[PDB]
């Protein structure tokens, strides 16, 4: 049905069109790969203009109908959950394999031999990196956090974070330690809440264990702090979806008052409702009343006499975040209150930030929790989102450093060492693999040359300079000068990447390259 | 002034037959890379905006929706290949289309297509007789029950990313087929769930049914996930506190009435909610979401519940514990309940997965797959589907013929000798049929990267030397016996393929004119 709007690419002219189409999409993010990489202007469909170099944002913001490029988006989508920092690196590496595959197609080599060639090329390169990798936590705990803190300072140098980066690097270390255990060694990013607001600067961004609801405590006379309440256990709070007040109808009000008598009768119903609600707080032994909806002013006046500070208008998702930190529960109604359902924390207070009129609140713990909240600020919207995602990128690095102690220095060093080892073993294979392994080493050289092009250096001269230093002297990690130093060594410069991160980057890149060559026919229909 | 068609396009003559030939080549050319286990995959974008990539000829031709009548016939005969057999839908269309290509020079010479179609019917009649001679009955002969299932599954899994882990995957593949009654085997009864993350060798086989655990609602750290003999209750309606859709308009002027209508909305829900406990079931499953109030009330009584379960998974739960779905909470009968041997919620893949295990009444199963990427696991699942069909048809059909080019050459070999005794146009037609049978072993070498000129010619040599079983080795390029390499297909596939391909060929060659009415 509907013969029209159906195109078919098959055989000869299909293989050339697939590589050039993936090259055009890759050439977009090539210049954006590096610490010195170039930004891009992205316009949302609503008309908002944003400027960022993040590959996960650029590939998601770009709307394309190319099915081969959609596989590139799925490539960066799966690795973003696993790593997140290899978004722009895996596509350029995969397209470099495609550019070398197109050259092999012109030589008369079948795509199946090319796919099997890149498969044995990855297995050989992984074994070479497995011998040259080093360990950190295998030495000392204080030395681990030393390399851990300085590793976050490296990944934060490509962002506006670079000024205050010493502070945000300590945040990435402390936030992970609290959400991880020594025996479990499991780091989960869901246990770290990333939150930020506009205003202030990046110097005012702190790291607090707890949640912040951004509330003034509903009334000025209420105290700015909450006491332990005379030898009680921590501070008990209530998480409820109903406000503290006489409840209101959600359809229509239209209350008819005939005379003064009916108005005085509602005063008793409103007053007696206050006593029924406060008694439920005293019997449950709760201090702060946190609810989803606002509170009555007359109800807050009785809370001043009973020494019961209250918090109103807290979102449903915000109520669940307190139950994770304070080990509480969401209670539907006032009569369901119990000591086991109340969140137990150390204290609650309203923390003032400079002269800013925000005046948020902080719920604390003083023991290791199952969740943390990273507090982020910035002088502008894009500054807040950049500092928040840059810190999240460091959290993904720390997660890989704890999960796998094997580490390598990845900038400009790995692709050269991988290329030098495969190029020497290419002559011993003696077959179709010799052309596949030679092109595999040349495709690996695209990444360090791309970094040299983004740093303002000769991609040909710098690449060979890194090779001669790793041959005439010894095999080690010597990378590109992008960040800058007196020399090109990545060791003393403290530029490190996870070994499990470099292995998954060269894997998924080779995997999709075989999947693109796996497609010998493309049939795309229209939109009915 | 007068017109015969009133503007309804109709074309006839020998050019219409040539137009039917070009349509068969276009359909064949698309399915050529998809032939064989190592064949390439096709990229198809449906008008539904769902991008799919598969090498199975059935799914391919169903999603293309070719409007051309002569090309649609090749799609209709492929659905018959999926019905009578279910495997080989790619080769039946390529072979039928190759008969159209070999009949093209006969049309230019002036040879009528009816003598061409009659020549194929005599060639297939002799071809099916040779397949019966190539049919080898084997059950316990020189093979055991375990070696017959394992050694045949290793070949289908060979030359794949699972080649190194194939030892573990054959065990779960053989146990999956043996987990079902050997009298009736259905691929739909074997469930497969993809688990993102984890090592490929750590995959587990579940005797019961498992699902995604889509429950998004809070109330965690309760409702224990490990039960011994849980009572499974299938539910329909919605137990959440604040409902999904409907509402009501209530006007009350009193404060105690404000709390009353809120408790009234609670009491109406808690009524049917408490009836769930009165049944006394540990597992509560529903295709509709189970709210916070319901999962909290189930937590106090230690009842586990999962909401928004897919309908395809709930149907397997019925086939597992032998339960039944009840609409309300009132009339629930005891026979609608079910129980497994063990219930556990696994965190495998950094994701929670509910699973039923040890169901004696289960007519279906579930096999979990793990791996480093979702796209790699999908290739493992499809390479497993090709392995399941070989293991399944091995028990269902004890008459096998050597595949991978073996049988295709022997059928083409003898028909060249049978054509020597027949004189006239039927001699060149049978020779064209035997030449048309050479496309199957050809495309197998071209799709796998092997040289079609050397391997096919060397295959025509040793096969002509008196050994009928020589096939094409898909692992290391060379000619060899597939009976030793254990590339096996039942005789019903080769018979139904030659019958269906020639039938569709005879239907297209018999069309002189295509009349298409517009409106």
Short mmCIF file of C-alpha atoms in Angstrom, two decimals, chain A residues 1-3 6 8 10-11 15 67-68 70-71 74 78 82 110-113 116 119 123 241-242 246-257 262 266 269-270 273 276 320 323 327 329-330 332-336 341 370 399 504 508 511 514-515 517-528, chain B residues 26-27 29-33 38-49 51 53 64-67 161 164 197 216-222 241-242 247-256 258-259 261-263 265-266 292-293 296 300 350 372-376 379 446-451 477:
data_model
loop_
_atom_site.label_atom_id
_atom_site.label_comp_id
_atom_site.label_asym_id
_atom_site.label_seq_id
_atom_site.Cartn_x
_atom_site.Cartn_y
_atom_site.Cartn_z
CA UNK A 1 0.00 0.00 0.00
CA UNK A 2 1.09 3.57 -0.82
CA UNK A 3 3.90 2.81 -3.28
CA UNK A 6 9.18 4.74 -0.25
CA UNK A 8 15.30 1.90 -1.19
CA UNK A 10 20.75 -1.39 -1.66
CA UNK A 11 24.09 -2.77 -2.83
CA UNK A 15 27.32 1.52 1.33
CA UNK A 67 18.06 6.01 10.60
CA UNK A 68 21.82 5.43 10.55
CA UNK A 70 19.45 7.26 15.02
CA UNK A 71 21.69 4.27 15.73
CA UNK A 74 21.04 4.96 20.57
CA UNK A 78 23.06 3.35 26.21
CA UNK A 82 26.68 3.27 31.88
CA UNK A 110 33.22 -7.61 1.98
CA UNK A 111 31.56 -5.89 4.97
CA UNK A 112 31.37 -9.22 6.80
CA UNK A 113 35.17 -9.54 6.69
CA UNK A 116 34.96 -9.78 11.83
CA UNK A 119 35.99 -7.75 16.29
CA UNK A 123 39.93 -8.23 21.60
CA UNK A 241 -0.58 14.72 51.77
CA UNK A 242 -3.23 16.72 53.66
CA UNK A 246 -9.99 22.70 58.26
CA UNK A 247 -10.20 20.95 54.88
CA UNK A 248 -11.73 22.64 51.84
CA UNK A 249 -13.85 21.22 48.99
CA UNK A 250 -12.23 20.72 45.59
CA UNK A 251 -15.40 21.37 43.52
CA UNK A 252 -17.43 24.35 44.80
CA UNK A 253 -17.64 26.30 48.04
CA UNK A 254 -20.76 28.52 48.00
CA UNK A 255 -21.31 28.37 51.75
CA UNK A 256 -24.52 30.23 52.61
CA UNK A 257 -24.53 32.23 55.86
CA UNK A 262 -24.38 30.52 61.48
CA UNK A 266 -18.44 27.69 62.03
CA UNK A 269 -16.06 23.75 64.03
CA UNK A 270 -12.87 25.55 62.99
CA UNK A 273 -10.75 21.00 64.36
CA UNK A 276 -8.26 17.48 67.11
CA UNK A 320 9.01 11.05 49.27
CA UNK A 323 10.97 9.49 53.79
CA UNK A 327 13.22 6.80 57.18
CA UNK A 329 6.37 7.19 55.49
CA UNK A 330 3.68 9.11 53.59
CA UNK A 332 -2.73 9.97 54.12
CA UNK A 333 -4.73 11.25 57.10
CA UNK A 334 -4.40 12.62 60.63
CA UNK A 335 -5.83 9.51 62.31
CA UNK A 336 -3.18 7.25 60.72
CA UNK A 341 5.54 6.34 60.19
CA UNK A 370 20.67 6.43 51.97
CA UNK A 399 31.37 5.59 40.52
CA UNK A 504 33.20 -0.04 27.17
CA UNK A 508 30.17 -0.23 21.87
CA UNK A 511 29.70 -3.07 18.07
CA UNK A 514 29.46 -3.91 12.84
CA UNK A 515 25.71 -3.23 13.07
CA UNK A 517 27.82 -2.74 8.16
CA UNK A 518 25.31 -5.46 9.09
CA UNK A 519 22.66 -3.45 7.21
CA UNK A 520 22.88 -4.19 3.48
CA UNK A 521 19.46 -2.72 2.59
CA UNK A 522 17.51 0.35 3.76
CA UNK A 523 13.80 0.79 3.03
CA UNK A 524 12.12 3.87 4.54
CA UNK A 525 8.42 4.60 4.04
CA UNK A 526 6.45 7.80 4.52
CA UNK A 527 4.22 9.11 7.30
CA UNK A 528 0.57 8.15 6.81
CA UNK B 26 13.08 -6.33 -6.74
CA UNK B 27 11.58 -8.47 -3.97
CA UNK B 29 17.12 -8.49 -4.38
CA UNK B 30 15.90 -7.15 -1.03
CA UNK B 31 15.85 -10.61 0.57
CA UNK B 32 19.22 -11.78 -0.81
CA UNK B 33 21.34 -10.32 2.05
CA UNK B 38 25.28 -15.15 8.69
CA UNK B 39 23.27 -13.09 6.21
CA UNK B 40 22.94 -9.33 6.50
CA UNK B 41 20.01 -7.58 8.18
CA UNK B 42 17.58 -5.20 6.47
CA UNK B 43 16.57 -1.76 7.76
CA UNK B 44 12.80 -1.23 7.42
CA UNK B 45 10.90 1.87 8.55
CA UNK B 46 7.15 1.29 8.72
CA UNK B 47 4.59 4.07 8.33
CA UNK B 48 3.76 3.39 11.99
CA UNK B 49 7.12 5.08 12.79
CA UNK B 51 12.09 1.15 13.12
CA UNK B 53 15.81 -4.58 11.84
CA UNK B 64 7.02 -3.69 3.72
CA UNK B 65 3.40 -3.76 2.46
CA UNK B 66 4.20 -3.88 -1.26
CA UNK B 67 1.17 -2.76 -3.26
CA UNK B 161 29.21 -13.35 19.55
CA UNK B 164 32.70 -18.59 23.58
CA UNK B 197 23.67 -5.04 32.28
CA UNK B 216 6.35 2.96 40.36
CA UNK B 217 4.54 3.79 43.61
CA UNK B 218 6.13 4.49 46.98
CA UNK B 219 5.78 2.42 50.12
CA UNK B 220 9.02 0.47 49.65
CA UNK B 221 11.03 -1.33 52.35
CA UNK B 222 7.88 -3.40 53.06
CA UNK B 241 -6.90 6.30 47.21
CA UNK B 242 -7.20 9.20 44.76
CA UNK B 247 -15.13 12.23 40.41
CA UNK B 248 -18.24 13.60 42.11
CA UNK B 249 -19.70 16.94 43.19
CA UNK B 250 -20.51 17.10 46.91
CA UNK B 251 -21.59 20.34 48.61
CA UNK B 252 -21.32 20.41 52.42
CA UNK B 253 -21.21 23.45 54.69
CA UNK B 254 -19.69 21.81 57.79
CA UNK B 255 -16.11 21.02 58.79
CA UNK B 256 -16.98 17.56 60.11
CA UNK B 258 -15.46 17.92 54.94
CA UNK B 259 -13.59 15.14 56.74
CA UNK B 261 -16.57 13.01 52.47
CA UNK B 262 -12.80 12.49 52.50
CA UNK B 263 -13.30 9.45 54.72
CA UNK B 265 -13.89 8.44 49.47
CA UNK B 266 -11.57 6.36 51.65
CA UNK B 292 -0.28 4.02 47.66
CA UNK B 293 -3.21 3.31 49.98
CA UNK B 296 0.36 0.34 52.29
CA UNK B 300 0.77 -4.21 57.15
CA UNK B 350 20.23 -2.96 38.62
CA UNK B 372 26.80 -5.60 28.38
CA UNK B 373 24.39 -3.84 26.01
CA UNK B 374 20.72 -4.06 25.07
CA UNK B 375 21.53 -4.30 21.34
CA UNK B 376 23.96 -7.19 21.89
CA UNK B 379 21.30 -10.32 18.82
CA UNK B 446 28.03 -14.13 -0.75
CA UNK B 447 26.23 -13.09 2.44
CA UNK B 448 28.92 -14.68 4.62
CA UNK B 449 31.75 -13.02 2.66
CA UNK B 450 32.95 -16.24 1.03
CA UNK B 451 33.98 -16.29 -2.62
CA UNK B 477 35.56 -21.40 4.34
#
